[PDB]
Design a protein around this ligand. Structure first.
Ligand SMILES: [Zn+2]
Ligand SMILES: [Zn+2]
Ligand SMILES: [Zn+2]
Ligand SMILES: [Zn+2]
Lengths: 413, 413, 413
């Protein structure tokens, strides 16, 4: 038959959404065999940079003093300032609670000591199994930076990630800081010249090719400022034009662009010091139109870029938009973004990614987003149901699978 | 009786909204006596450019191959790709279903062949009577382009539109492509000079005057790019200043501006290749302030222009804003736009227009929009009812008539 | 006794919100002992500039004729045009009704004459007691302009405001119209030179210092245009850099910036002729980063500046954002703004201010805003209750006190 009641439909959508294994196509997590770079712990959750920014709006403790404290002390301060002295109603604070509850811990007691004991008696491998199970995440895409001495080592040592973890080649240093990076390249055997000649071009391409072969990335990525433009006679513009795009096309690897971040407007805050700005769509429009054989994954930081980004996706099939990034990762914005996207793109987009920096975040990141996405799906199905259309649970499971996993794998080939 | 609760209010409002005859002040429909230019058919509905854009995001069929197929083949592909392989949850797909259901056809069967048979046994005149009846549309405003050889002929042959259809003089070729258009003008007896002198000015005005007399348009219209500015030393700026405005004032005809469309960012897609951009409000502000004796109808394409456009309407009574155009014609946006408009303008605006290109679209266009507009009205009436205001059903019927028909006719005199 | 259900939660929050005494940190009201500048009356409510703009969209009465009528005649016209000829559904009209109902008058009768009689038999001091009581407002922050001959007099006469009223030093003439203002300064004994030298700098600082000592303002304020930038080699840029900031720091007085207003786009409308524009965040960002020892209160006029303003607050603890100003003071916007703010800032912001120009407006301004703020809180508390957190009624009361009063006083010291 078909679904005949609004209740069955809802039960059906929520169940399908909750049961669908998720492919988180963009995170800052690492296969557990990569070592300490994989962050997890209630102390890591509480010291997430989102919460550092928030605690600094309340506490009288200087930023210097904060950075001087131990992670445990920072966590204690954040807990006291954001959870005890004021209700933890922000999205980031709410998330910490969702993680605790999901792990079987009880937020009702506010017993941070007891919460810590839970983690003290587990290994990274165990927690990963636990979390991926609780968050129903089957595949995690990492952010792998070959310019980070730490991460760099494991890749050179031939270490391969857990089969549940996939690599993504981060190129920010190369594209945004070529002047300083070119020195490290030549130091690694990549003889780039001071002038952008065929020699420099071939060496940069070799660097990319070497790492593509080494990581077997699902895509190459870069985060860009509000002022991003293309074409552009700059190191970034030339590298993208002469090296990145050609290589990406040859290996049929998508180019992921996270646009709109204004770095370090408040240096002292570190990762919590980045701001946002609306970008022009001209550069993305040009890339999509002039490079029809290249695939692009895009997410933008400014609320004001979201609707036009959806419209751009209507224009180019070689564009796949994804997630509600950072400052967009808040219920009010996730909801409006997801509705605009489905209304203009049907199911041809990737609703969300976690951008998790701490393992446990996969729990709240996906739990918070799934309930909103389910609500949107229920309304959209109810609307065509009202129009006389019949939908089957199989069709819903199909649609949900496309949104949470298939659209991505299908796009990166 | 007494409307003394949100519940009674909801019933009375929905009834009033549903029963109110609609004047669709902007469409791409034509009086049936104008011939084949009047599109209608389930195949026409499925090949609407909104769906072409959407199918191209999914199908592997090349755009060239798509355009090579017959309309029936295109419709079959779109149906399979957007309705069968994925649930038809997008607004445009949902609309097709609403039309079918409204005509008495059953979407539950997904029998495209049976749907086609319905249309095969009807004439244009009959379908028009059927659709206008089902969509409860009493008056349709057309988009009449004197630069289109096809349409041009019927007007020259003295053919007059059905009394339910009204004309609107489209001037895009003249204002946006004067360099190429000036040649057609002189070829039609309008001796415009290479230089913008009094001779050219008088000839352009004569062209406008001749067509105003020929069509008896309710308003003159033009769609403009995000970069639109005024004053401006350009063909567009000079024609508007020296010809359009003076003539519009003399005949007391409103000037309609549809701002924000960036034409052909993806040429191969044809009508489905247009993009959007936020525009500056400076030009509109200047026109409203410096030409107090001219009337302006405005709608904008960018989500980011909507709130400030509402504020501009608060500033100038010679400005009438209307509808949720194109990329704004989606539930999430229609809702936010309609609420911002009513909150700052009360009932002094035109909530919607269909922009229908295919006859049957009047059904879903108005059905989808009316349910949203009705909900906004219920909230607003309830808020004053709870404040102690007594709203009568007659007052609701009056307000609803203003929003859906009278405000337009009152503005265009 | 834990909060067992959302329904019970809804009640505790609404009670706390309704019972919490409000500090309205930005209004255009005056202590009753300041004289006629304190506007109150149903006629004043109806002739509020928000309604002037709205009536002009409907009435055929010329703007000249309108200004020529007496306040009573204007009120009669506005009442007839916006309440009788069309339902009073706009936010501003709804507000008038809420005020009447709150005062015990009955909107159901639409008896404007009877409403007027209520006010005719009361004094300013009495109405102030009545209104502050009904709106549950314990503290009102005024807008005091030393450049207004009228207001200026009472301050020079040593008149001190009622203890419920606080002063805020308005500096628009000085910062935005220095060229014309410098003449008044020297005329008052402040010997500023034509050139911006140390002499001019010291004299401007003396002017500020003299008025700070005279008003004992909670903060110094200025409203700025969409084009506002800083640093800037202009009178405004230099005065802010060399005089305002240093003085503000020395006295630890916050600098309030209301950004985005485009003055007089429609001169004839007077106060109702101001428009809006999106501003760059660069100037505010620079001020916050380069002047860590200065405190800034910011509110912006453009809908499109709201989200990034929230993000900027996440970056700088010396920034306190407040209210939904003017064109933002509409339910649809207040809701989205308040949700974005709480999601990214928890309770570290000031949700609203009335900007009341007419005494009675405190009633609707706060009643309309409180219901929305209460709904947002109910949702946010429900989300953490759902995550296992045990919110207590006393904690809700504390959070509510912070949002409506304590955050402000805590920020201004
Ligand atoms: Zn919204
Ligand atoms: Zn990331
Ligand atoms: Zn159109
Ligand atoms: Zn104000």
């Amino acid at each position: 038959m078909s679904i005949n009641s609004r209740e069955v439909l809802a039960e059906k959508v929520k169940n399908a959404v909750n049961n669908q294994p998720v492919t988180d196509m963009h995170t800052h997590l690492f296969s557990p065999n990569f070592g300490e770079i994989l962050l997890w712990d209630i102390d890591e959750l509480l010291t997430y940079h989102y919460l550092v920014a928030e605690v600094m709006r309340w506490t009288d403790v200087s930023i210097e003093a904060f950075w001087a404290m131990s992670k445990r002390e920072q966590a204690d301060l954040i807990w006291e300032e954001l959870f005890i002295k004021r209700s933890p109603v922000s999205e980031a604070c709410r998330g910490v609670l969702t993680c605790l509850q999901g792990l079987g811990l009880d937020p009702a007691t506010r017993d941070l000591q007891v919460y810590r004991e839970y983690f003290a008696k587990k290994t990274s491998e165990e927690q990963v199994d636990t979390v991926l199970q609780l968050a129903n995440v089957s595949d995690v895409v990492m952010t792998n930076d070959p310019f980070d001495d730490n991460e760099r080592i494991s890749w050179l040592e031939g270490k391969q990630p857990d089969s549940r973890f996939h690599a993504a080649l981060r190129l920010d240093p190369l594209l945004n800081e070529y002047e300083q990076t070119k020195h490290r390249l030549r130091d690694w055997g990549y003889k780039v010249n001071d002038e952008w000649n065929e020699g420099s071009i071939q060496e940069v391409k070799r660097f990319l090719t070497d790492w593509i072969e080494r990581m077997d990335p699902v895509y190459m990525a870069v985060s860009l400022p509000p002022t991003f433009s293309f074409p552009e006679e700059s190191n970034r513009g030339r590298i993208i034009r002469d090296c990145l795009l050609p290589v990406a096309e040859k290996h049929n690897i998508p180019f992921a662009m996270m646009i709109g971040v204004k770095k370090r407007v408040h240096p002292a805050l570190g990762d919590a010091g980045d701001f946002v700005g609306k970008a022009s769509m001209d550069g993305v429009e040009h890339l999509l139109r002039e490079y029809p054989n290249n695939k692009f994954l895009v997410t933008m930081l400014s609320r004001e870029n979201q609707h036009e980004l959806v419209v751009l996706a209507r224009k180019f099939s070689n564009l796949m938009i994804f997630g509600c990034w950072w400052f967009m990762n808040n219920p009010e914005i996730i909801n409006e973004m997801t509705r605009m996207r489905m209304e203009m793109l049907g199911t041809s987009f990737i609703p969300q990614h976690s951008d998790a920096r701490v393992l446990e975040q996969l729990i709240y990141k996906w739990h918070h987003s799934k309930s909103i996405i389910a609500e949107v799906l229920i309304d959209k199905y109810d609307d065509i149901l009202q129009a006389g259309w019949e939908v089957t649970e199989e069709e819903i499971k199909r649609d949900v699978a496309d949104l949470f996993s298939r659209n991505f794998w299908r796009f990166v080939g």
